[PDB]
Structure 1
Amino acid sequence: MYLRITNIVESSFFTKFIIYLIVLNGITMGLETSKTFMQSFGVYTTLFNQIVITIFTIEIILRIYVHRISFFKDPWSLFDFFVVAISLVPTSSGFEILRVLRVLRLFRLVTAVPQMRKIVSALISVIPGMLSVIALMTLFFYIFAIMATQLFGERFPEWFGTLGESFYTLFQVMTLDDWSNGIVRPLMEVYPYAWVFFIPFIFVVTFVMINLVVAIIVDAMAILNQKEEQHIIDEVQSHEDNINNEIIKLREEIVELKELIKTSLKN
């Protein structure tokens, strides 16, 4: 069975077929957005849906047989797995968010197209080196969220009532979103020094952001420089090695000229 399966799964027809289904299913999901469309064609697309997820379920199964344990070490396959699994949770449930979580299957367009994987992968590649700064930042947010909650939560429960609330508001302030007329001018009417809290906050988060970006650019180009430097330097020291080695064969060719005469009379 294996090779018979393996050769259908690995084919140029298979993945092409899936992509095509994904794109159709994606057009189909936009149409289900229009209740007008749904009362006039909804039955056609409610099962187009149901059989596409059938095909994807089958595809997922075959691919597991064809790849066995190496399937679940694949980030992309793992995603396909979970994003399909989700659509298998019953279309009528107590948790009804999962029905909307079904739309994530359109991200298989990313999974199955290598230009897209390329993009995404490039994007992800910058993150591991940011985690420490992510960390420093989250710790910064958390300390200030605690302070803001103790300082402002009593009189301003909506914005600062709760740590989670102060977290939310501090993010808002970070995005510079209606932070003065909308948040701290109102705070200052009760707490005139509130600006000594939020303006340093704004300096720090903005400083950290910019410099992260700056640091990325500059450190990338410092590696590009090093890699270029060695090339130039290898070429300089294989080419100036010859001019050194060629003159030595002349410094030598004259000392052997010299001896030829050093054994002239002698005898």
Structure 2
Amino acid sequence: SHMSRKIRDLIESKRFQNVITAIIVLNGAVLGLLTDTTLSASSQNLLERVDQLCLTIFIVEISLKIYAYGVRGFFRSGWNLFDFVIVAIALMPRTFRIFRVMRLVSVIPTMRRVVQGMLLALPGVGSVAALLTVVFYIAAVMATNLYGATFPEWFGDLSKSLYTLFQVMTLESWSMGIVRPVMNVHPNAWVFFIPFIMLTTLTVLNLFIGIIVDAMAITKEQEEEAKTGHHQEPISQTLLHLGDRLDRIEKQLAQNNELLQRQ
């Protein structure tokens, strides 16, 4: 309709996106000031008043979108479902008001395309995250049984062991703080710890390198799908078939010159 077109063309404009962006920055700025313990009683009501003013602008913005696109059209996008929940949770009877700043990711398209590539990369590294989980669990059980009676603060139970093993994987005070003290009581503790470090830092790097490389390609390819309007063959698919394609055109040229030979 006419009204469901003037409103939709306003929502898609960069001026509307900029206004909503400024309101999200204002909301985070006042929630930042609200961390000041030394504030006046009047300053707090004034800042929380600006928080309500921000939140009610988002309600008008979400309603504008639901009217302009429809219920099926608006809730079709996952980013719009996220936007809705962020705003709708503020009306549900909470130190997590600052999570409202996460809307900067969904409202700024370049930021939305960066996080999107990372989210789409996650399924690809599912097996590596599972492999790291298995290694942490087997290690936490072993550490609890081996060192829990002598080192209860660190390996007292499975939870204590999982936390310590995470600390050890991040290399934080692993030797001076954990393994050298454990070694005064258990001299061969390095046989557990050193291989654990080698195996976990390798797997974490594989997990991070994987997400980074896949998010880089997924983003680049979605950028090209947006530009050409058609499906982009993943770079690995092109790379796997590069040889196959190259030697097919060589055979076509040898057969091509065989026909020219008889002339």
Instruction: Name the aligned partner's letter for residue 113 of structure 1.
Output: I
CA offsets per residue over residues 85-124 of structure 1, 9 Å max, x none?
333345xxxxxxx2x2111111111101111111112222
Q: Following the alignment from structure 1 to structure 2, what is the Cα–Cα distance between the partners of residues 116 and 172?
A: 31
Among residues 91, 98, 111, which one is paired with 1:88 in the alignment? 91
Are the aligned partners of 1:174 and 1:206 in contact in 2 as well (CA < 8 Å)?
A: yes
Instruction: Name the aligned partner's letter for residue 243 of structure 1.
Output: N
Residue pairs, 1:30-69, within 5 angstroms: 30-36=32-38, 41-65=43-67, 66-69=69-72
Q: Work out which of the two has the higher radius of gyration on C-alpha atoms and give 1 or 2.
A: 1
The alpha-carbon distance between structure 1 residues 88 and 133, as it changes in their structure 2 partners (threshold 3 A), is same
Superposed displacement of residue 166, structure 1: 0.8
The alpha-carbon distance between structure 1 residues 236 and 112, as it changes in their structure 2 partners (threshold 3 A), is farther
Are the aligned partners of 1:153 and 1:160 in contact in 2 as well (CA < 8 Å)?
A: yes
Superposed displacement of residue 58, structure 1: 2.9
Residue 144 in structure 1 maps to residue 144 in structure 2: no
Q: Following the alignment from structure 1 to structure 2, what is the Cα–Cα distance between the partners of residues 195 and 149?
A: 15
Superposed displacement of residue 50, structure 1: 0.6
The alpha-carbon distance between structure 1 residues 197 and 25, as it changes in their structure 2 partners (threshold 3 A), is same
Instruction: Name the aligned partner's letter for residue 53 of structure 2.
Output: I
Are the aligned partners of 1:8 and 1:14 in contact in 2 as well (CA < 8 Å)?
A: no
Superposed displacement of residue 26, structure 1: 2.6
The alpha-carbon distance between structure 1 residues 112 and 244, as it changes in their structure 2 partners (threshold 3 A), is farther
Aligned partner of residue 101 in structure 1, secondary structure:
coil
TM-score (norm: length of structure 2) = 0.76
Question: How many residues align structurally?
Answer: 239
Residue 8 in structure 1 maps to residue 7 in structure 2: yes
Greater RCO, 1 or 2 (C-alpha within 8 Å, sep 6+)? 2
Among residues 165, 168, 172, which one is paired with 2:163 in the alignment? 168
Q: Report the equivalent of 2:203.
A: 208
The alpha-carbon distance between structure 1 residues 54 and 214, as it changes in their structure 2 partners (threshold 3 A), is closer
Structure 1 unaligned spans of 5+ = 91-97, 251-267
Among residues 175, 179, 186, which one is paired with 2:174 in the alignment? 179
Residue 188 in structure 1 maps to residue 183 in structure 2: yes
The alpha-carbon distance between structure 1 residues 215 and 48, as it changes in their structure 2 partners (threshold 3 A), is closer
Superposed displacement of residue 232, structure 1: 4.3
Q: Following the alignment from structure 2 to structure 1, what is the Cα–Cα distance between the partners of residues 66 and 86?
A: 15
Q: Following the alignment from structure 2 to structure 1, what is the Cα–Cα distance between the partners of residues 191 and 184?
A: 14
Residue 246 in structure 1 maps to residue 260 in structure 2: yes
Instruction: Name the aligned partner's letter for residue 87 of structure 1.
Output: A
Indicate the RMSD between aligned Cα atoms, in angstroms.
3.0
Q: Report the equivalent of 1:77.
A: 80
Q: Report the equivalent of 1:156.
A: 151
